[PDB]
Structure 1
């Protein structure tokens, strides 16, 4: 629109988090406005328009629950929503509640500084706006700053793309020699799409990722009508799980079962499709021998999928425990490699030397290409904030405080930066659960908190230094009882050169985490000092 001078609560970003903050603060009777870089609402589902983009949580799980009207009216069509359909859903929710009048688009926040004189935040943008707001809510997302791989990039003659900043006009790869770098789920979702148009598809793999089949399906309209009858009930069940979905929590240890029961329980998971296998046994994430048992089964499934055993073996992920990078759902990605026009280039054995203007040189050879797609992921969890000059008490940069890894109390707040809040970021369950559930819980908790400051005539909320320190020690310690910290992944910050290695997330589970938050709020926000 045109942003106001002054406001109770300013919110950065218009994706699932932003929009919800906005609605609920209006419903709390507070003044609120949102600033967003993009052209319209959407967040990851506005930016990641690459062909094949699709969620790995079931449509019925990956949605809002705050609005009974919305559960009733909206019709999902598939087990997993593709990106254009999740975007229609966000647009449907935005029209419903007229959220757009609360949002300025095309505008990036560049700086923010806390003024101890007034207990208020002063916020700057790239258009020149300067806004003043008692509270700052960073809803700038976890996987919102695209990351380019590490020499010869401006030299490329052909066309160049990132999956996480995809053009709005569809792209035509017909005829072309095309390369994709990256086999994350971006890489793995967009390749089979490209392999349909192009004359030649080169997939540049570094470390192979474990992917299991999605087995997408139509969503039976009967089933949806039935669920609608019990919908709030259904979400409440998800809200009472470690992961925020209906995944079954395998009670047994993967070491305890026989070999034949392992093959059967797991085979049954492979036929069903989806990520639920992750919780097939309790210790897949807590014990290296358990994990290797599941890992090997899956590796053989990957071997069975391609005819040419030389290529197959290049696709088998090695050297890290199963599940310790995000688990990826594939749809016809492994079958793709049986096509004549698809070539797997291993950069574990022959690293990428440089990009030339014609293509990509490994040690081994040069590869000539007309178009190049980077599926190389994001500066995850801390990227978005690090692009912003944020300054607290004593004029400390957040960049300086968090330089050795994020330091938070509950992930919600950082000491020395009062009245500042982070939605679904480091210090909290974040992307280790269904993010609609993590996100809704944080928005309700932060915004309850704001409501509670106003009713009680307070104006300053800061996390206590020693309570933040204890939360950090707690997060690291529970991380270190699992296999997560063992492995380089975006969870750790490992795909950004020179980024500190630190498992950035709460691994306890959504459910414990919520409990802790409710106790904290119940006690009057213990661990915070309010004045």
Structure 2
């Protein structure tokens, strides 16, 4: 285990996509920098989520780093949507190429951080009892890094998709339960159904899912892409989603029934999340949302042969696309299998895990294996700022920030891909955040300044601006973003503009002192 240094210019927490780029870029900027990572190796979510079928919902040609010309040319993606093992290979490749592991302490969890106003430095403590002093603290701890009764009593094998075993798990001949039908559950379930004698899928709220239509990547298409890759990326940087996506100019309410079917069916066959932008008002007008939503509901009823099973898979009562759109591969087809059973926990809630399996209010399920398809990381850290106020106390109602990058009362602390989550392609959003944050840190050293803190009045103005954009959309209607709405919905390109304008005006909204 590489022992962390006692002093460093910048301490980064997390060695996923965000933390590795922060370490790389601060090294290029001539700053001392070190990373603390709970995991045993690099990768972030792509290190932890090793379950079968784990796969990204953003095209491989967009979900990648762009800071390195050599990486853009040397690496060859293989499919439309890269699987977790391929993405992990990619990350390890980048870490190898730039010698990043020499600046990372693995198997180590940051537990406390306190700002010393007398020295303008953070004092950072770990679960190993390490004590690191850093002028700046960068939280690259992700936003995606259960309380059932009797969980400890289960006699079979318990697995979590978010911390899957590193050796593959053979479910052949087993009775298996999967709890959770979000992205993890929808991805892992069809893989288990191929091996298991019986598969029970425990579903609470049914989610919207559209086909991925994953396919191998045409290598002559890629070859042509690599010679214009820098241009292709700047186009992505100038979109609201941080990726190439057609912006449908028509309202969903102005076309006929046959045309809506025709346009939406063309998206359905092509696959991917681009259907979110089939019509300009899908996420802004509730009637337009329900019209597209009802098209998807009927595709579900059409794929599942059992009408009673099909209806319980149909999502009802909340808008399409407000929570992040899941791509499915043979998930709805899975319920036509004889060894697959949909368990509706809304009608019969889970009362307790038992030694034998799962008991709902109606039935006991005998299982050999149980799969739990599961401000988080920040709240487990005792971060204390000015006046020793706790970040968790201040962020109780939701995360109050300026630009999603910093919060007043907590100087020299920056969050990467935390609040504001601007683009749906997180790799474009991450690179923009890391570049902005590390440029600011470089600016502070250039000018001899040592303390950077968001102005409270500007933080409030930013919070009220985020809430105001949201009310033009249907996003506020699902409480998964809730008091303080924690998502800038104005689109990546406009968010990038705001950040660039602040930096060009001497970091307006921050107080810079020495």
**TM-fit CA distance, 1:426:** 1.1
Q: Is the 8 A contact 2:155 2:356 kept in 1?
A: yes
Query: Which residue of structure 1 lines up, in the alignment, with residue 425 of structure 2?
Result: 434
Q: Deviations 1:489-519 (Å, cap 9, x if unpaired)?
A: 367xxxxxxxxx6531111100010000000
Q: Deviations 1:179-205 (Å, cap 9, x if unpaired)?
A: 000100100000000001110000001
Q: Is the 8 A contact 2:181 2:373 kept in 1?
A: yes
**TM-fit CA distance, 1:7:** 0.7
Q: Is the 8 A contact 1:406 1:427 kept in 2?
A: no
Distance in 2 between residues matched to 1:435 and 1:324, nearest whole Å: 17
Query: Which residue of structure 2 lines up, in the alignment, with residue 51 of structure 1?
Result: 52
The 10-residue stretch of structure 1 (101-110 or 472-481) with the greater mean CA deviation from structure 2: 472-481
Q: Secondary structure, in 3 states, of the residue corresponding to 2:22? A: helix
Against the structure 1 CA distance between its residues 266 and 442, is the aligned structure 2 distance closer, same or farther, given a 3 Å change threshold? same
Q: Secondary structure, in 3 states, of the residue corresponding to 1:284? A: coil
**TM-fit CA distance, 1:351:** 1.2
Q: Is the 8 A contact 1:241 1:511 kept in 2?
A: yes
Q: Is the 8 A contact 1:409 1:427 kept in 2?
A: no
Distance in 1 between residues matched to 2:270 and 2:170, nearest whole Å: 34
Give the root-mean-square deviation of aligned CA atoms: 0.9
**TM-fit CA distance, 1:136:** 0.4
Q: Is the 8 A contact 2:186 2:331 kept in 1?
A: yes
Q: Is the 8 A contact 2:247 2:277 kept in 1?
A: yes
What count of residue pairs does the alignment treat as equivalent?
510
Distance in 1 between residues matched to 2:419 and 2:69, nearest whole Å: 30
Q: Is the 8 A contact 1:202 1:343 kept in 2?
A: yes
Tell whether 2:510 aligns with 1:519: no
**TM-fit CA distance, 1:362:** 1.2
Q: Secondary structure, in 3 states, of the residue corresponding to 1:7? A: strand
Against the structure 1 CA distance between its residues 76 and 107, is the aligned structure 2 distance closer, same or farther, given a 3 Å change threshold? same
Match of 1:271 among 248, 269, 274: 269
Q: Secondary structure, in 3 states, of the residue corresponding to 2:224? A: helix
**TM-fit CA distance, 1:152:** 1.7
Q: Is the 8 A contact 2:400 2:484 kept in 1?
A: no
Q: Is the 8 A contact 1:178 1:369 kept in 2?
A: yes
Tell whether 2:470 aligns with 1:488: no
Distance in 2 between residues matched to 1:476 and 1:157, nearest whole Å: 47
The 10-residue stretch of structure 1 (356-365 or 237-246) with the greater mean CA deviation from structure 2: 356-365
Q: Deviations 1:212-245 (Å, cap 9, x if unpaired)?
A: 0000001011111000010000000000000011
Query: Which residue of structure 1 lines up, in the alignment, with residue 189 of structure 2?
Result: 191
Q: Deviations 1:348-394 (Å, cap 9, x if unpaired)?
A: 11111111111111111111111100112xxxxx0000010100010
Distance in 1 between residues matched to 2:207 and 2:480, nearest whole Å: 10
Q: Is the 8 A contact 1:410 1:428 kept in 2?
A: no
Q: Deviations 1:26-58 (Å, cap 9, x if unpaired)?
A: 100011000111000000000000010000000
Q: Is the 8 A contact 1:461 1:530 kept in 2?
A: yes
**TM-fit CA distance, 1:427:** 3.0
Distance in 1 between residues matched to 2:15 and 2:68, nearest whole Å: 18
Q: Is the 8 A contact 2:286 2:319 kept in 1?
A: yes
Q: Is the 8 A contact 2:463 2:484 kept in 1?
A: no
Q: Is the 8 A contact 1:413 1:422 kept in 2?
A: yes
**TM-fit CA distance, 1:324:** 1.4
Distance in 1 between residues matched to 2:37 and 2:351, nearest whole Å: 37
Q: Secondary structure, in 3 states, of the residue corresponding to 1:485? A: helix
Distance in 1 between residues matched to 2:138 and 2:125, nearest whole Å: 14
Note the residue ranges of structure 2 that are not aligned, 5 or more in a row.
none
Tell whether 2:415 aligns with 1:409: no
**TM-fit CA distance, 1:488:** 3.5
Distance in 1 between residues matched to 2:484 and 2:377, nearest whole Å: 18
**TM-fit CA distance, 1:428:** 4.2
**TM-fit CA distance, 1:248:** 0.6
Q: Secondary structure, in 3 states, of the residue corresponding to 1:283? A: coil
Q: Is the 8 A contact 2:178 2:185 kept in 1?
A: yes
Distance in 1 between residues matched to 2:481 and 2:401, nearest whole Å: 19
Give the TM-score of the pair, scaled to structure 1. 0.95
Note the residue ranges of structure 1 that are not aligned, 5 or more in a row.
377-381, 492-500
Distance in 1 between residues matched to 2:308 and 2:435, nearest whole Å: 52
Q: Deviations 1:111-170 (Å, cap 9, x if unpaired)?
A: 0000000011111111121111110000000100xxxx3412111111111100111111
Query: Which residue of structure 2 lines up, in the alignment, with residue 507 of structure 1?
Result: 489
Q: Secondary structure, in 3 states, of the residue corresponding to 1:137? A: strand
Give the TM-score of the pair, scaled to structure 2. 0.98
